[PDB]
Amino acid sequence: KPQVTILATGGTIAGSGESSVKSSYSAGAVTVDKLLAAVPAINDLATIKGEQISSIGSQEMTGKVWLKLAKRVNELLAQKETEAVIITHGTDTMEETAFFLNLTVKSQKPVVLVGAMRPGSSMSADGPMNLYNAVNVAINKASTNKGVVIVMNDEIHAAREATKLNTTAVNAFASPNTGKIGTVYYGKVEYFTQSVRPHTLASEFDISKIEELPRVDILYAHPDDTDVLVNAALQAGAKGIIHAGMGNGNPFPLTQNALEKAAKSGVVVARSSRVGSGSTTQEAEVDDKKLGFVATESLNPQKARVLLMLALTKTSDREAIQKIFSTY
Amino acid sequence: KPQVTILATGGTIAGSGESSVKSSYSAGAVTVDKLLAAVPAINDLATIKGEQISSIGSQEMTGKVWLKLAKRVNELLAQKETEAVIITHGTDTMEETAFFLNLTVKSQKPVVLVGAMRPGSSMSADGPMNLYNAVNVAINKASTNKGVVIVMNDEIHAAREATKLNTTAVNAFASPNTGKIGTVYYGKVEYFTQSVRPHTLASEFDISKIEELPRVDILYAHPDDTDVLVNAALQAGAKGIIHAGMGNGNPFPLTQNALEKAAKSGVVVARSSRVGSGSTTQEAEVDDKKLGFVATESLNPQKARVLLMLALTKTSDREAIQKIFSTY
Amino acid sequence: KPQVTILATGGTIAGSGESSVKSSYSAGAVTVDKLLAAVPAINDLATIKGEQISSIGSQEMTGKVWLKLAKRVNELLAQKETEAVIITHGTDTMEETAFFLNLTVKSQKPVVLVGAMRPGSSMSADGPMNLYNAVNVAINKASTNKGVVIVMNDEIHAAREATKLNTTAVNAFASPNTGKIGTVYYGKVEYFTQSVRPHTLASEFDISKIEELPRVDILYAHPDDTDVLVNAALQAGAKGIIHAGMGNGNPFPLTQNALEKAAKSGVVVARSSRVGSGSTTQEAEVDDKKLGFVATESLNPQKARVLLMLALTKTSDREAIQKIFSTY
Amino acid sequence: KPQVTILATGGTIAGSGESSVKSSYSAGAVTVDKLLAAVPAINDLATIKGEQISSIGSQEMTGKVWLKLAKRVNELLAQKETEAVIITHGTDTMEETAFFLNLTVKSQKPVVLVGAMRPGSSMSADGPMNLYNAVNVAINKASTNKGVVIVMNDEIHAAREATKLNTTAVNAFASPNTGKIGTVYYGKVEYFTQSVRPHTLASEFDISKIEELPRVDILYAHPDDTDVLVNAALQAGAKGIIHAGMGNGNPFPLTQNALEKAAKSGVVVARSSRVGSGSTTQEAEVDDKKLGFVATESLNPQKARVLLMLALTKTSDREAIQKIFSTY
Ligand SMILES: N[C@@H](CC(=O)O)C(=O)O
Ligand SMILES: N[C@@H](CC(=O)O)C(=O)O
Ligand SMILES: N[C@@H](CC(=O)O)C(=O)O
Ligand SMILES: N[C@@H](CC(=O)O)C(=O)O
């Protein structure tokens, strides 16, 4: 039987509420051991080792825990005996952790993130099936070299493309610019596409000696916008700013002016969008070259932040960072 | 023939680029008169009066223009001769303008917002058809008392529900929590649903004597989040803050602490979500009553901002504002 | 406590498989009584009476069972003590039964259909939450006069608009031409829109004296299509044919010829589409008036069949049936 | 400049209506030469040769034309000078043609299918931009070995996954089980994923010596279904039947009995679904091995028909055909 390690971080999958029919609960309340005992059929599939990396709601995730988790995954997958890793994780920021790992894990062995939109104490809790299916994906031969994936609601999503697109639904995960790469239905795994953007072994990023990640803020654009948040981010030592712009990455004028100043001072300014999907494109209404900005293209603000944080471990050059957004 | 007024504000619909096959352009470059001449068939449908309210990209919209526009629409619709108003507008913040008008226009006569994702100079420009269809919706008997609507890509969307969900696509408008209320296909108008949330005549808000709207900022949540933007918004005189939270409206703990302080100081803190769709609910992981926050429920951050701005014209009470978010 | 009757028909909600982690199962295997005992919290909400109408997979539904079910619902809702009815039903044809009831139930009291995409024996079975939520929708004051609704996956869908759009997903139900009318999240019910198309009390149809429904066949269009299936449907006594056409209701020429003959012989031919969404429109590429056909507009083939079956209980006139498709 | 051949077959892209503001038109009314002259900017990109293969609405497509087209594409791509082929085609059955070519074209050079939902005579006609973008995709270096693609509405869809999902919308194309593999925005081409199912050079099918394809019918399932259409298809010499079943490929019992007889007589019976998306799976409610049926898995009925037609050129064995549906 293949050997897999499950790394637990917390989340609603390890969550608990007082009533099976009320929505109120606490995430990251249940230990890995207790979680794995709820789904005994996984032991028929693999030899499982569990480990507790953290016990938090993913809304409390930090770069420190990301670094810890990436180093540990890399350690585990370097072992001959370990065929894959599964990470149990809150859904709120699962897309950030997955995207981070997709660019920092140096292996072609599967890494699967899995969560739940309902706590295990809930009626019709989704976690048990999601976990069963994640183990099936982790051990499947076709899961090699697919990059880091999210397995939720019978779907396999590529880390670069995945996002949580709804606040409460069990089907909240989507890949709005592509779609899922595969399915897993009562454990039966099928892939239909793969990412052609570089990941994992092909990624230039390496965090093995990094203790702290660069600071990157995200700003939310709107009419009658301001300059005070740009200024506050600068004052707090931001090395990069993601601007979640109106439509195709458009800023309000006051804000644009403040961002132009930030970019002159050596803070990388990257244009994304608040809309939800599509590319924040070059050569539309904003002259990025003149203003000193990067266009994030087909990402979203929160994943663009992760990519910019990694870019900043190597460079702050505008062109070099544009190339990184145009590659990964 | 019915008489309709077209109020122009600018946008890509009145936009212009150097090449029909390149994506670069300037919004709000074409006058209303020139715009109406591109689509002569509208004169077969109605007697059209055009009026220039502004000439800007909608990313430059301000409350001052919203107020000017709302007062002018109310004036026009009070006239016996005027059957409807159409507003030509940039797509980037069309949803904010429409939502604002939906709560401030005191008439049951149709108000239709229309724009274009491609400028009129482009190959396969969408503006002409969108405008033709908007005039048909404006004059349709079933359009009465539907509230303010957006007409884009052969669809009719309710202002409360509509959002721009894609950066570039002609089909970027959606109503992710409901769906379109009707269709318009080569001028043929059909409605299938209507909003059951109060709007227009049934709205408690009145801006007739308002010259400036309260300041409301929006913050974008993520892992390793900060308190400095909350603090900067407070220091700039924010009367309300929309927090675009992780998943179902969840803040990072440092940020939560700063928001709790903001709310004690008398600044209304309203929880929305960065995810895109769904309700930011009460009684999930965040104890809104204990912390002093409002849950925005089934809105998004930019529309929640508009509602909170209107609410703040008369109250900063947490419970009264919750009731407003739970009603409109 | 409000009194509600649950009418069980079978389906995967009342289904059973040998293993909680295998996809294989039998629908309609579990009695109503056993089903209701799996979700004891419903008794806190209402006084429940259960009844067994049938015990089948919805793929075995027949017009006979529809008639039985509609007469029984009408009987129950005529009682002063009965506040609503819930029907437990297979998901495969739930949209047909719901649409049928939406046009034959003569009450404004709620009628809620509910099912499950996973049997109750499955890990992470959806039925229990779906049922809990359906009871909440049934007793909610705002559910009056909404027409017949489907409650699945925390969503409330209008019967006219709902369809099963995926083979296996718990979120398989959608309303592709509108969207859901409301939500129900751990029992909390909210409506955002309502249908403006006539239903229930406003429907002209009455099945109280009908023992058998007219025969209507559905044909699937494609390139290199044939005339032999039209001819076979005619020979078997079809009173109507739904043609699920290519794109916007387009037939292949051989088939068109056979359909033209059918329509001359007095068999109503109604044009729908195989695509999934949108209106099958008048005055596009097919000259319906010349050929003797009806355009089904914004329905799908299977719901168009139900509507045509009901239309045929009153008339076979082409114009009158066009008007019915243009109204309901 | 790269040399490309444009093969015209007809469709709404080569369509014409009497009015730019009315929906009525005739497809396949405009010659290739006239079509290419509407979009002169394509001559800046490539050296274009046009060729008229047919002049029809795609609803009139036949296997004879498919064969003619496939042989001609293979001929053209065998030429050293020809870098790609673009096929202008009606949208109604573009997905069938693309899928067929995806299994029969023995080259890695790009083949792009393109159409339009509005005729060139219409206001805001989509054809010009779609064609411009198709030429850019055809000449892009990353388009090699992606298989046959559909380019519509700024999107690039894999032939195996694409379908027309709406009757009238310019954005009617989708890939509901995956999503688009790339984008093309004012000619700028980007790929994000690729199919991992075998196509083109890797396909086992060869039609070079085929003059006529096997007959395969499609049936549309519903409640109170019949056996007469199965019987009529058998009597007309069907070699295969696609059954568009209820939910996850479920037949009505009378129909099932007739299909079981068809399969005993040596006619291949393949189970698909009427629902629109998802896999019609093995080992759910239907025992395919016992009954003698194939499960079509993640296709739809019209594409399953194409695959079964190709399969039938060499085998009618149930297990061999299952393996084909489970591979391609
Ligand atoms: N707040 C939770 C939500 C979930 O897991 O569904 C988390 O992200 O940890
Ligand atoms: N920036 C433009 C975008 C558009 O109209 O499509 C505007 O909103 O004015
Ligand atoms: N075949 C089942 C499927 C389900 O209920 O999910 C039925 O419709 O009865
Ligand atoms: N009936 C037309 C529809 C279109 O091209 O849009 C065709 O498929 O040829």
mmCIF file of C-alpha atoms in Angstrom, chain C residues 23-25 27 59-64 66 92-93 95-96 164-168 215-220 222-224 226 228-229 232-233 236 244 246-248 250-253 273-285 301-302 305, chain D residues 23-25 27 59-64 66 92-93 95-96 164-168 215-220 222-224 226 228-229 232-233 236 244 246-248 250-253 273-285 301-302 305:
data_model
loop_
_atom_site.group_PDB
_atom_site.id
_atom_site.type_symbol
_atom_site.label_atom_id
_atom_site.label_comp_id
_atom_site.label_asym_id
_atom_site.label_seq_id
_atom_site.Cartn_x
_atom_site.Cartn_y
_atom_site.Cartn_z
ATOM 1 C CA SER C 23 -21.334 4.929 -6.083
ATOM 2 C CA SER C 24 -23.657 1.940 -6.775
ATOM 3 C CA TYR C 25 -27.163 2.072 -5.220
ATOM 4 C CA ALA C 27 -33.332 4.434 -5.599
ATOM 5 C CA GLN C 59 -36.670 7.621 -14.055
ATOM 6 C CA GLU C 60 -39.748 5.338 -13.781
ATOM 7 C CA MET C 61 -42.259 8.196 -13.321
ATOM 8 C CA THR C 62 -45.420 8.190 -15.418
ATOM 9 C CA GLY C 63 -48.313 10.511 -16.104
ATOM 10 C CA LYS C 64 -50.456 8.270 -13.952
ATOM 11 C CA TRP C 66 -48.250 12.721 -11.733
ATOM 12 C CA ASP C 92 -33.756 12.763 -12.450
ATOM 13 C CA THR C 93 -37.263 13.944 -13.292
ATOM 14 C CA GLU C 95 -38.071 19.168 -12.775
ATOM 15 C CA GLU C 96 -40.891 17.621 -14.796
ATOM 16 C CA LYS C 164 -30.928 19.098 -13.321
ATOM 17 C CA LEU C 165 -27.842 20.219 -15.257
ATOM 18 C CA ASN C 166 -25.195 17.689 -14.099
ATOM 19 C CA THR C 167 -25.224 13.917 -13.800
ATOM 20 C CA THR C 168 -23.687 13.472 -10.273
ATOM 21 C CA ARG C 215 -48.937 11.368 -25.565
ATOM 22 C CA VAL C 216 -45.999 13.659 -26.374
ATOM 23 C CA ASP C 217 -42.656 12.358 -27.765
ATOM 24 C CA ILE C 218 -39.308 14.154 -27.726
ATOM 25 C CA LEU C 219 -36.782 13.859 -30.568
ATOM 26 C CA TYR C 220 -33.092 14.577 -30.445
ATOM 27 C CA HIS C 222 -28.332 16.031 -35.062
ATOM 28 C CA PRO C 223 -26.551 16.060 -38.379
ATOM 29 C CA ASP C 224 -27.642 13.398 -40.840
ATOM 30 C CA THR C 226 -33.865 11.028 -40.058
ATOM 31 C CA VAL C 228 -38.195 7.443 -39.059
ATOM 32 C CA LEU C 229 -38.573 8.567 -35.499
ATOM 33 C CA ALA C 232 -42.833 6.114 -35.451
ATOM 34 C CA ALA C 233 -44.119 8.676 -32.970
ATOM 35 C CA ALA C 236 -47.845 5.299 -31.951
ATOM 36 C CA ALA C 244 -34.899 19.222 -29.445
ATOM 37 C CA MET C 246 -29.770 22.079 -33.150
ATOM 38 C CA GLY C 247 -28.808 25.528 -31.809
ATOM 39 C CA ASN C 248 -31.842 27.804 -31.859
ATOM 40 C CA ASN C 250 -33.111 24.110 -36.040
ATOM 41 C CA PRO C 251 -34.075 20.803 -37.665
ATOM 42 C CA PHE C 252 -32.248 18.814 -40.245
ATOM 43 C CA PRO C 253 -34.127 19.010 -43.633
ATOM 44 C CA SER C 273 -33.336 23.021 -28.379
ATOM 45 C CA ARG C 274 -30.770 20.408 -27.366
ATOM 46 C CA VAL C 275 -28.293 23.121 -26.169
ATOM 47 C CA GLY C 276 -29.286 23.565 -22.532
ATOM 48 C CA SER C 277 -30.274 27.199 -22.125
ATOM 49 C CA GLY C 278 -31.753 30.190 -23.892
ATOM 50 C CA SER C 279 -34.921 30.727 -25.784
ATOM 51 C CA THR C 280 -35.936 28.736 -28.830
ATOM 52 C CA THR C 281 -37.181 31.883 -30.586
ATOM 53 C CA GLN C 282 -39.766 32.860 -33.207
ATOM 54 C CA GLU C 283 -38.600 34.625 -36.354
ATOM 55 C CA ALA C 284 -35.045 33.380 -36.465
ATOM 56 C CA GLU C 285 -34.229 30.799 -39.227
ATOM 57 C CA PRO C 301 -37.370 19.928 -24.126
ATOM 58 C CA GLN C 302 -38.520 18.056 -21.087
ATOM 59 C CA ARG C 305 -43.203 18.345 -23.109
ATOM 60 C CA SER D 23 -33.255 38.498 -35.777
ATOM 61 C CA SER D 24 -34.349 36.703 -39.004
ATOM 62 C CA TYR D 25 -31.653 35.562 -41.420
ATOM 63 C CA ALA D 27 -27.153 30.956 -42.926
ATOM 64 C CA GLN D 59 -27.972 22.104 -39.185
ATOM 65 C CA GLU D 60 -27.816 20.509 -42.683
ATOM 66 C CA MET D 61 -24.412 18.914 -42.127
ATOM 67 C CA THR D 62 -23.986 15.239 -43.091
ATOM 68 C CA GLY D 63 -21.256 12.582 -42.677
ATOM 69 C CA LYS D 64 -20.504 12.965 -46.354
ATOM 70 C CA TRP D 66 -17.482 15.588 -42.645
ATOM 71 C CA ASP D 92 -25.229 24.645 -34.359
ATOM 72 C CA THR D 93 -23.103 21.565 -35.100
ATOM 73 C CA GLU D 95 -18.981 20.860 -31.909
ATOM 74 C CA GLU D 96 -19.707 17.641 -33.866
ATOM 75 C CA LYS D 164 -22.958 25.174 -27.756
ATOM 76 C CA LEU D 165 -24.833 25.704 -24.528
ATOM 77 C CA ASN D 166 -27.190 28.589 -25.386
ATOM 78 C CA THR D 167 -29.545 29.213 -28.341
ATOM 79 C CA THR D 168 -28.657 32.871 -29.144
ATOM 80 C CA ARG D 215 -25.736 5.016 -38.805
ATOM 81 C CA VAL D 216 -26.126 6.089 -35.138
ATOM 82 C CA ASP D 217 -29.378 7.463 -33.730
ATOM 83 C CA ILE D 218 -29.923 9.487 -30.571
ATOM 84 C CA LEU D 219 -32.953 9.081 -28.328
ATOM 85 C CA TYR D 220 -34.224 11.551 -25.746
ATOM 86 C CA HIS D 222 -38.249 11.169 -20.282
ATOM 87 C CA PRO D 223 -40.942 9.863 -17.945
ATOM 88 C CA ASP D 224 -43.538 7.632 -19.576
ATOM 89 C CA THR D 226 -41.522 4.355 -25.101
ATOM 90 C CA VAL D 228 -41.138 2.588 -30.494
ATOM 91 C CA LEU D 229 -38.212 4.878 -31.296
ATOM 92 C CA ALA D 232 -37.762 2.319 -35.481
ATOM 93 C CA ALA D 233 -34.028 3.025 -35.254
ATOM 94 C CA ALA D 236 -33.828 1.697 -40.177
ATOM 95 C CA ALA D 244 -29.712 10.625 -23.708
ATOM 96 C CA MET D 246 -32.459 10.985 -17.317
ATOM 97 C CA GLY D 247 -29.927 12.212 -14.735
ATOM 98 C CA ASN D 248 -26.853 9.918 -14.726
ATOM 99 C CA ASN D 250 -31.017 6.358 -16.572
ATOM 100 C CA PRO D 251 -33.655 4.909 -18.909
ATOM 101 C CA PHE D 252 -37.330 4.401 -18.377
ATOM 102 C CA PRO D 253 -38.032 0.638 -17.941
ATOM 103 C CA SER D 273 -27.392 12.012 -20.497
ATOM 104 C CA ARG D 274 -29.874 14.752 -21.356
ATOM 105 C CA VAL D 275 -28.706 16.953 -18.447
ATOM 106 C CA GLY D 276 -25.883 18.922 -20.048
ATOM 107 C CA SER D 277 -22.734 18.215 -18.085
ATOM 108 C CA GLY D 278 -20.980 15.582 -16.012
ATOM 109 C CA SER D 279 -20.039 12.009 -16.595
ATOM 110 C CA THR D 280 -22.540 9.263 -17.448
ATOM 111 C CA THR D 281 -20.763 6.833 -15.195
ATOM 112 C CA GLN D 282 -20.267 3.076 -14.897
ATOM 113 C CA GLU D 283 -21.420 1.313 -11.726
ATOM 114 C CA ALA D 284 -24.150 3.730 -10.572
ATOM 115 C CA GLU D 285 -27.770 2.543 -11.017
ATOM 116 C CA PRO D 301 -25.036 12.815 -26.648
ATOM 117 C CA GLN D 302 -24.030 14.516 -29.834
ATOM 118 C CA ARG D 305 -22.631 9.812 -31.373
#
